[PDB]
């Protein structure tokens, strides 16, 4: 497939409707992602990683942080994946917490630096 | 070629076959332990003992074990040669160092020893003693169903991964039950007239059972029933019909002596005797029920009001 | 053929490893949309616009219940 | 040997399991493809197969002869007549259990040899104790009343499957002793050619 | 479509003498499980074995051919009188069916013998066969449609050696009269 | 050594991992393709298949110390304690069946916990050895060390006290219940 009819793909899996149906919604994720396709800043999983291991220490579910190390190892043991820091970026961001300043915290790399 | 082909393909023909088994593993130490080996002795010199060897593969060791567990002979593992099963020396798998393997078939060779000589028992049965042809029908009722735990074993064989270490662990009760036979017929073995040779024997299980006083006591109590069932018999027999019906002088009047009957038998004699002189002027039915309504103890004692009441009747 | 079959199975173990993180992340998505997401995120695409898609969606999806 | 297995058990044999008047049923023991072990539980398993063809030519030899045109039952006559009848009902759930075998089978593309040896190994025994049943009336010309002695002697066997089964026998000839004492005790006939009812 | 095809039914077989992807790569049919087919391949073989040590002396060919219920149907047919594609007027199955053809062999001989309608007592006897040889014309082909090969041979062999009897009460000489109500006394 | 670890550490040894009657399970030392720090961790895991190797040759030995009850109990008690170790083992390896390279730390870290409790139990059936422990002290040489206190030694000692109070209870629901005594040599 094609990331065009694959966005519409997934508007059609959040909103339980047909293509025919919700086409307001497809027009508004085409201006999103569209004009923001390239990545802004520098891959790395590490970062990425040592992240989620630090949202995962902050919940006190000091357990799940080092069984999140074995399953990150395992993405490497397969092998079938080739962007492993962009589904990592986007599971961390979707996360919830089942119960404030990051601009001290490790961010990602600019990419402005380079001649892009 | 085109059908032999076909099998050369579909059957798994290594071992057992005049050809040297040569075997597709994976690789990767797990299973390249037999190369591992060999390059380390020959860094620490043996020197070379290269020794020419079958190389089995995995499965087939557990389908051997199980023909072993069956009773069954001529097997291409545990080759007997005197009535006495041992492992062959050729047999090395991928892992297990050659020297492994002996060791744990040498632990179920000593199994196959217990399962094969009660086979010989039961052949030279088959091929009026009354006593021991009662004995062995106890042994191989028992026999039958142990072997169809063995043989659901080989279905998932064919049809879940299985290995050593998970078959041995699952036949764990039945490998424990088994070395009481081993210690209960060697007593039965051991030993020349006819009377002595059953008598022995029957007292022999009423002092083992005393002794386990649960699954192994319902095993010497189910083989304790269908082994006194003879004697049983002949004295309801003597009660009842007024004389004594003896094949080879089984019982132990002779027309020394098993302490299990001891406490009632002068009310035996003593009615044996008296209704012989009346005629000329189901009792194991009834043992059997007594288990349905302090193990052969006090649970034996209830047995005597059985042989007593009708002792009471005949005398009176 | 075979090599067409082992791709198949090194495909089901990261979509299970991948939906095991999902669930320890606590994220809303289940196997169905995540299959669509890891395809996305294979071509190329910015996280933070994908992730926003998803947060505006799943928004609006609530106003209309 | 799936279905020839079940075929030669059946009494028809087949020149994997090469009768032999000498040696029964015999795999012919040189097999590329199979190997001795299996042999050796094929062989096991035709030792019932060489009894049952013994067994079924037996009564088809000797049914007392056939419409009896010297005789003493089984080379003319009337209690061993009875034998026979006893015989072939015996070893009907041998013939009904191979039934019930192949419908197994039929259900199940790979069932294994060990799954027959279990389910047959309950007529293993019960075969060749009726075979010494036979063989003394063969052996020993046993006329008349005295086959009735003859399993009698053997119904205190302590085999449990074997005793009932030697029993049935026994009630079945007890019927034609009962059918002649009903003609020479009410009627004041004997029926009685060349055989005996102990009246003469 | 390939994570459509990734949620197919998985293979829980293992070995350990297969570690790196080993789905499952099952235990070539051990021979005596594995027939009706290779079992039957297997007869073909022997046979061709036995004609090779003979040398074209033997010659043993035909194996194959054809079905199990129509051949119930032609024995069964076989007991009426019938002709057949194998009755004219593996490979054990011709023993078996001699056992049950010899059967209907006298049945023909029976309808040869008493179809006529010298002696009026022998009539009588003849009229009295024709009475029993239709029942065993009914019992036949009331419960069979199509059953399997053994159970025929079992099913017809408590009636069947009967009707061999009946060959030795008749000739298939034959007394007349007061003789023959006397002798079938 | 990733299989012949996990058969040394089943008791069935393997002449890298030498059974010696000293030395329990001993690893030759003399390796040019490892080396002197590995052979420090596969040494202090031999310590568990040593002091498992000489359980269960005790309880093969004696199951019927020296001949009798109570501490034929004993053994009934000792391998059903040992039972999770076992269960433990075969789950490592199902693990390394699904991954072809794991470490002995990862080993190190399933077993760590019955690194503790085994050389906790071998005093337990030393004291018995030792002072030839006749009859019913028995029970009390157990529970003076049921005041363990390791919460899994304590309570793995536990079992095994409720196991031979089962044929103490035995002889007792016979003396006071119907008056005789079923006791030979033991009391």
Redesign the interface.
């Known amino acids: 497939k094609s990331p065009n009819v694959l966005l519409q793909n997934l508007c059609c899996r959040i909103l339980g409707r047909s293509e025919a149906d919700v086409a307001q919604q497809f027009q508004y994720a085409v201006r999103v992602i569209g004009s923001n396709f390239a990545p802004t800043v520098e891959r790395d999983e590490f970062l990425v990683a040592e992240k989620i291991k630090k949202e995962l220490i902050r919940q006190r579910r000091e357990a799940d942080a080092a069984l999140f190390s074995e399953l990150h190892r395992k993405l490497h043991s397969q092998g079938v994946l080739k962007n492993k820091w962009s589904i990592l970026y986007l599971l961390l961001s979707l996360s919830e917490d089942p119960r404030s300043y990051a601009t001290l915290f490790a961010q990602a790399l600019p990419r402005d630096a380079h001649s892009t | 070629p085109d059908d032999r082909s076909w099998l050369e393909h579909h059957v798994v023909h290594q071992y057992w076959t005049a050809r040297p088994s040569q075997f597709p593993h994976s690789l990767h130490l797990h299973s390249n332990l037999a190369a591992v080996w060999d390059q380390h002795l020959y860094s620490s010199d043996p020197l070379y003992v290269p020794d020419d060897r079958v190389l089995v593969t995995e499965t087939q060791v557990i389908r051997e074990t199980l023909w072993l567990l069956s009773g069954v002979k001529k097997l291409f593992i545990f080759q007997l040669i005197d009535g006495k099963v041992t492992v062959r020396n050729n047999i090395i798998v991928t892992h297990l160092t050659h020297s492994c393997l002996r060791s744990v078939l040498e632990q179920i060779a000593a199994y196959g020893q217990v399962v094969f000589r009660l086979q010989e028992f039961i052949d030279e049965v088959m091929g009026p003693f009354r006593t021991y042809q009662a004995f062995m029908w106890a042994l191989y009722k028992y026999f039958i169903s142990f072997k169809e735990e063995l043989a659901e074993i080989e279905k998932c064989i064919i049809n879940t991964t299985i290995t050593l270490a998970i078959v041995v662990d699952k036949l764990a009760p039945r490998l424990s039950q088994l070395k009481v036979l081993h210690k209960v017929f060697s007593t039965g073995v051991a030993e020349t007239r006819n009377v002595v040779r059953a008598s022995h024997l029957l007292n022999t299980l009423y002092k083992a059972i005393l002794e386990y006083d649960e699954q192994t006591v319902s095993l010497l109590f189910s083989l304790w029933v269908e082994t006194v069932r003879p004697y049983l018999q002949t004295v309801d027999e003597w009660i009842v019909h007024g004389h004594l019906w003896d094949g080879a002088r089984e019982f132990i009047i002779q027309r020394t002596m098993v302490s299990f009957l001891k406490p009632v038998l002068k009310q035996i004699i003593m009615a044996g005797k008296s209704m012989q002189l009346l005629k000329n002027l189901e009792l194991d039915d009834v043992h059997d029920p007594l288990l349905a309504i302090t193990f052969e103890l006090t649970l034996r004692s209830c047995l005597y009001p059985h042989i007593d009441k009708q002792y009471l009747d005949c005398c009176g | 053929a075979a090599a067409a079959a082992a791709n198949l199975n090194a495909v089901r173990e990261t979509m299970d490893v991948l939906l095991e993180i999902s669930r320890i992340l606590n994220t809303g998505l289940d196997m169905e949309t995540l299959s669509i997401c890891v395809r996305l995120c294979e071509q190329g695409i910015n996280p933070e616009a994908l992730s926003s898609v998803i947060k505006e969606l799943r928004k609006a999806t609530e106003a209309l219940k | ?4 297995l ?2 030669a058990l ?1 009494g ?5 399991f090469t009768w032999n008047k000498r040696s029964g049923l015999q795999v012919s023991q040189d097999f590329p ?9 094929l062989n ?1 398993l035709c030792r019932l197969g060489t009894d049952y063809i013994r067994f079924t030519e037996f009564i088809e030899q000797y049914t007392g002869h ?2 009896q045109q010297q005789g003493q039952g089984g080379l003319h006559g009337i209690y061993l007549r009875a034998f026979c009848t006893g015989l072939d009902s015996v070893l009907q759930p041998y ?1 009904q259990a ?2 019930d075998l ?1 419908q197994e089978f039929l259900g199940d ?7 027959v ?2 389910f047959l ?2 007529f293993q ?1 019960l075969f ?1 104790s009726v075979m010494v049943v036979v063989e003394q009336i063969k052996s020993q010309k046993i006329h008349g009343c005295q086959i009735l002695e003859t399993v009698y002697k053997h119904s ?1 066997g ?3 499957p074997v005793r009932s089964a030697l029993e049935k026998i026994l009630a079945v000839c007890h019927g034609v002793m009962y059918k002649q004492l009903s003609a020479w005790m009410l009627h004041g006939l004997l029926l009685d050619q060349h055989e005996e009812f102990f009246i003469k | 479509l390939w994570e459509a095809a990734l949620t197919y039914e998985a293979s829980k077989r293992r070995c350990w003498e297969r570690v790196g992807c080993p789905p499952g790569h099952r235990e070539e049919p051990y021979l005596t499980e594995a027939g009706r087919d290779a079992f039957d391949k297997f007869c073909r073989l022997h046979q061709g074995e036995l004609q090779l040590l003979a040398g074209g002396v033997l010659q043993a060919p035909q194996p194959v051919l054809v079905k199990e219920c129509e051949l119930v149907k032609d024995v069964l047919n076989v007991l009426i009188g019938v002709v057949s594609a194998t009755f004219s007027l593996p490979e054990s199955i011709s023993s078996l069916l001699s056992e049950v053809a010899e059967y209907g062999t006298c049945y023909t001989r029976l309808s040869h013998f008493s179809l006529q309608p010298k002696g009026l007592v022998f009539q009588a006897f003849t009229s009295g066969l024709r009475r029993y040889l239709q029942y065993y014309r009914a019992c036949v082909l009331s419960t069979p449609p199509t059953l399997s090969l053994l159970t025929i041979g079992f099913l017809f062999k408590k009636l069947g050696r009967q009707l061999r009897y009946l060959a030795e009460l008749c000739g298939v000489a034959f007394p007349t009269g007061v003789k023959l109500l006397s002798y079938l006394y």
């Open positions: 040997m799936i279905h020839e079940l075929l059946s028809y044999p087949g020149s994997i493809f199979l190997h001795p072990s299996e042999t050796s539980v096991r056939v419409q013939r191979l039934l192949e593309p790979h069932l294994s040899i060990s799954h040896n279990y190994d309950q025994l060749p205190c302590g085999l449990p």
